[PDB]
Structure 1
Amino acid sequence: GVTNPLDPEEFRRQGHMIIDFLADYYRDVEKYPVRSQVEPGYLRKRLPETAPYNPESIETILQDVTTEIIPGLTHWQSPNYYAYFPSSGSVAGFLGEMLSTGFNVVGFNWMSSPAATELESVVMDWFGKMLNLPESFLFSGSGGGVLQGTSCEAILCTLTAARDRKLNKIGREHIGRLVVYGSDQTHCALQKAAQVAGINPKNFRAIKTFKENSFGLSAATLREVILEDIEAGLIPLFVCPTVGTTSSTAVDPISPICEVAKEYEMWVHVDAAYAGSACICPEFRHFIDGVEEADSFSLNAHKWFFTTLDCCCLWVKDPSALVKALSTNPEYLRVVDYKDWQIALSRRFRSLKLWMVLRSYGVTNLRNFLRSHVKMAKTFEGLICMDGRFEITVPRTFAMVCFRLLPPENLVLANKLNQVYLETVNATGSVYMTHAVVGGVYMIRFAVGSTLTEERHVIYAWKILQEHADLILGKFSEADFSS
């Protein structure tokens, strides 16, 4: 009569069906245009306006996924996807999420599933030791790590913990004097966290960075701004140095910044959402030097660690600061209770993803995975440098190369040349790159991180960039870009 929506045999049959559907997708993803070519509003036209009253077959639904959903996808998993930062995935990460979705437990507390809490603390110590984090960040020592969804939520929680730590000493009425510090390259997640956490919009600082420092935040500039804020009656609270900025993969020097922060009793959060995973490699560990003097450190394992979206790894020195700000149990009372470390109460079993990746691939293969991305980007950088019509705009640090086509007021023309040039390349659907404007310079970003990407795809992307460079420069007139 009525089949249970979780019937084991129907789960088995349809599950095998979708596995085959997805394996075919990874096999054929290259045939699709990378950036979706549908028009806004395409899907509402093709779909009914109301839910169906009677059930539809999984066979019919899967066909609609092929005809209606897949065209409206920008294929982050395409090997020719080089936009933004990678949606780094893997078989192991996918299986860990499906085991998490299969068990479907709610990690509201330890008792709700003890493994969903204890496995998280183990793998965060695993990951932290591979990162060579100090014992002050590990359960092994005096710290701790927590898995979250995104970096914005992680930054939000460390910010409220920093806010509550200061306001509980000086009074809640001073919230309108707290200043949050970033660079003009810091990701929009910091400003959003400050807006949600009640920081005054006029008290967010995006400190100017300079080409002479490759747009990394100078501690000398940070101290100048703090003294200005202190003279204006404000209270410096929070600074967020970034390793691997999203625009140009700039790197803020953590140790000089923390030195300035301790003088003014400021919380330091190190944002390494993308590049942090590379410090698993000994030759890249120097990029987070000085993290031992910071209060919190975060990276997105879904960006450059194969887990699949989403898995944010947050290490803190003082988890009590998170609990004091995020727990709802009375202030006096304020086993691990992870819900008091983050926003989400109905936590997902995210540690399975990280556990699967670490076990299925091991430290050695994971290092070489990240190294292969960096090496393919180093090759792309070498190909650019051998073509005198191009220019590397900032030093490459982690697997992303920023470059621009040069023209054969001059900056505005060059910027327009690269916007048109990039746009014709993306319009082919053969590859996908995004851009950034750093120091007034419109530059193209080539971020090699898609798991399916091999050297032949990077070389193929170089061929298309060269062919389109031949096209635009061959018929170049500066009046065509002087508008």
Structure 2
Amino acid sequence: MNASEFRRRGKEMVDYVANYMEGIEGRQVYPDVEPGYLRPLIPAAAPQEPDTFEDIINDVEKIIMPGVTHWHSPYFFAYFPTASSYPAMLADMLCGAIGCISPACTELETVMMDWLGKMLELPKAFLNEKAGEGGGVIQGSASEATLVALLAARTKVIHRLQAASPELTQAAIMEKLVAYSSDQAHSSVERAGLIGGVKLKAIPSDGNFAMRASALQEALERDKAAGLIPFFMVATLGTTTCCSFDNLLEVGPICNKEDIWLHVDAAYAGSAFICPEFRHLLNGVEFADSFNFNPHKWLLVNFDCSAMWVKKRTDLTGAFRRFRSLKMWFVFRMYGVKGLQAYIRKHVQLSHEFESLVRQDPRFEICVEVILGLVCFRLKGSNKVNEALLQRINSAKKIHLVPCHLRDKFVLRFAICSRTVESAHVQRAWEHIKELAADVLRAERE
């Protein structure tokens, strides 16, 4: 098709999109289709002549929609929020026109990482605006980022021990290397240790599911005693399981003095640190060698955006593609800092709403302190009761919740995710959960 025809149809698709979004509340979030429903609906071969746009869009409604998961539904309460903003869509559009994989890309990235750095109020050591030795950079995921960090640290320690002891071979050194994370850390850490070919050990967390000084130091002594070599440690701010926070201020100086590279994975919670109410949870970065979080989670930049800063950017070269700063730029300019702060606080509020609806009911309990946007709750009593509860919910198909385990407790996770969630939805949700609970607790007397 020619330019002029894209105009008619692009604008049409813009309308089609807006509609889908405006009416999204109406859709059953999860698909109920029987395998192989699709093939009969689509012809055996490609068409010789072009089809009409009318026919194709109809077909998107009739054929594709029924078979897709609508995660932008405000009724999606699983995992963590996944960024989808209209400003990013507009960027993707432009970005599709230009194409990408020169200087505007690299430069807007550096400057955007500086914008974001100033927002999270990071130590100047991570910022390269005033000529600093460190800087920011966009990765595809927290996981990739953690890997990039593990491998920079690996390279580092090798270059150190070899400088001080030339006779020493790479193979012989990596045999000894040990890395760390909290027992609450994310799989991406294990992934990294295996790719990086080193040993990974978990530190036991405390009753707030946080890594502390004493526990980390036990570990280190234990492994140094056996001749192993600490080189890398990941600290999680906003664990996947229950949004708990490693004690960065306790752990930072330890890592420093033990010549252990400290990476802070803040993939979800990191977004909230642009609000002064939450910035303190980040106190400690001072000590970190690298810091990462996912704007494509809670900062409205559409997927593929992961933000990482390092104290020494040449440390990073040791590890040896797209135009993502454009999205960031659009999102930041189209919302402003204030608007972003509001986005965050609106979720946090709604999470506290749900929280206090649960407390208020003598039958339930909160399991972890509710810090920001995730609620870990439970029906008082047996696990089995709560596995029963989650079944009912997940079977009813109105909402969907993801259980986790906290030591020995089975726990239900409610997560404020979507861009358009209001107080109304959260309430509707809690109704549904509470009907189903009473049902369960009544089938408990039989």
How would you bin the TM-score normalised by the shorter chain?
A: over 0.9
Equivalent-residue separation in structure 1 for 2:222 and 2:37 (angstroms): 52
In structure 2, do the counterparts of structure 1 residues 286 and 53 end up closer, same or farther at CA, with 3 Å as the change threshold?
same
Give how far 1:229 is off: 1.5
Residue 36 of structure 1 pairs with residue 31 of structure 2 = yes
Tell me if the contact between 1:94 and 1:307 (Cα under 8 Å) persists in the aligned partners.
no
Residue 157 of structure 1 pairs with residue 167 of structure 2 = no
Partner SS for 2:424: helix
Structure 1: segments with no counterpart, 5+ residues: 107-112, 327-346, 408-413
1:223-258 CA-to-partner distances (Å, cap 9, x unmatched) read 111122112221111111111101010100112111
Q: Corresponding residue for 1:122?
A: 111
Equivalent-residue separation in structure 1 for 2:409 and 2:380 (angstroms): 11
Equivalent-residue separation in structure 1 for 2:349 and 2:4 (angstroms): 46
Give how far 1:60 is off: 3.8
1:76-108 CA-to-partner distances (Å, cap 9, x unmatched) read 2001111001112211122122222221122xx
- Identity rate of aligned residues, in percent? 41
Q: Corresponding residue for 1:17?
A: 12
Residue 356 of structure 1 pairs with residue 313 of structure 2 = no
Tell me if the contact between 1:210 and 1:439 (Cα under 8 Å) persists in the aligned partners.
no
Residue 367 of structure 1 pairs with residue 341 of structure 2 = yes
CA RMSD of aligned residues (A): 1.9
Higher mean C-alpha displacement, 422-431 vs 452-461? 422-431
Q: How does 1:441-480 map to 2 (within 5 A)?
A: 441-477=409-445
Higher mean C-alpha displacement, 121-130 vs 430-439? 430-439
Equivalent-residue separation in structure 2 for 1:349 and 1:93 (angstroms): 12
Tell me if the contact between 1:76 and 1:86 (Cα under 8 Å) persists in the aligned partners.
no
Tell me if the contact between 1:32 and 1:429 (Cα under 8 Å) persists in the aligned partners.
no
In structure 2, do the counterparts of structure 1 residues 399 and 14 end up closer, same or farther at CA, with 3 Å as the change threshold?
same
Partner SS for 2:335: helix
Tell me if the contact between 2:234 and 2:262 (Cα under 8 Å) persists in the aligned partners.
yes
In structure 2, do the counterparts of structure 1 residues 44 and 227 end up closer, same or farther at CA, with 3 Å as the change threshold?
farther
Q: How does 1:431-446 map to 2 (within 5 A)?
A: 431-446=399-414
Tell me if the contact between 2:135 and 2:309 (Cα under 8 Å) persists in the aligned partners.
yes
Tell me if the contact between 1:180 and 1:239 (Cα under 8 Å) persists in the aligned partners.
yes
Q: Corresponding residue for 1:221?
A: 215
Q: Corresponding residue for 2:177?
A: 178
1:95 to 90, 99, 105: 90
Residue 257 of structure 1 pairs with residue 251 of structure 2 = yes
Q: For this pair of structures, how many residues does the alignment match?
A: 435
Give how far 1:55 is off: 6.0
Q: Corresponding residue for 1:318?
A: 312
Q: How does 1:310-349 map to 2 (within 5 A)?
A: 310-326=304-320, 347-349=321-323
Residue 398 of structure 1 pairs with residue 363 of structure 2 = no
Q: Corresponding residue for 2:22?
A: 27
Give how far 1:169 is off: 2.8
Equivalent-residue separation in structure 1 for 2:226 and 2:58 (angstroms): 62
Partner SS for 1:241: strand
Tell me if the contact between 1:179 and 1:204 (Cα under 8 Å) persists in the aligned partners.
yes
Q: How does 1:38-437 map to 2 (within 5 A)?
A: 38=33, 41-42=35-36, 46=40, 52=46, 54=48, 57=51, 58-106=53-101, 113-140=102-129, 141-170=132-161, 171-173=169-171, 174-199=173-198, 203-211=199-207, 214-326=208-320, 347-407=321-381, 414-437=382-405
Equivalent-residue separation in structure 1 for 2:243 and 2:41 (angstroms): 41
Tell me if the contact between 2:364 and 2:378 (Cα under 8 Å) persists in the aligned partners.
yes
Higher mean C-alpha displacement, 368-377 vs 420-429? 420-429
Normalised by the length of structure 2, the TM-score is 0.93
Q: Corresponding residue for 2:165?
A: none
Equivalent-residue separation in structure 2 for 1:49 and 1:243 (angstroms): 50
Give how far 1:168 is off: 2.5
Partner SS for 1:282: coil
Partner SS for 2:157: helix
Give how far 1:67 is off: 3.3
Tell me if the contact between 1:135 and 1:142 (Cα under 8 Å) persists in the aligned partners.
no
In structure 2, do the counterparts of structure 1 residues 11 and 390 end up closer, same or farther at CA, with 3 Å as the change threshold?
same
In structure 2, do the counterparts of structure 1 residues 176 and 12 end up closer, same or farther at CA, with 3 Å as the change threshold?
farther
Equivalent-residue separation in structure 2 for 1:156 and 1:143 (angstroms): 19
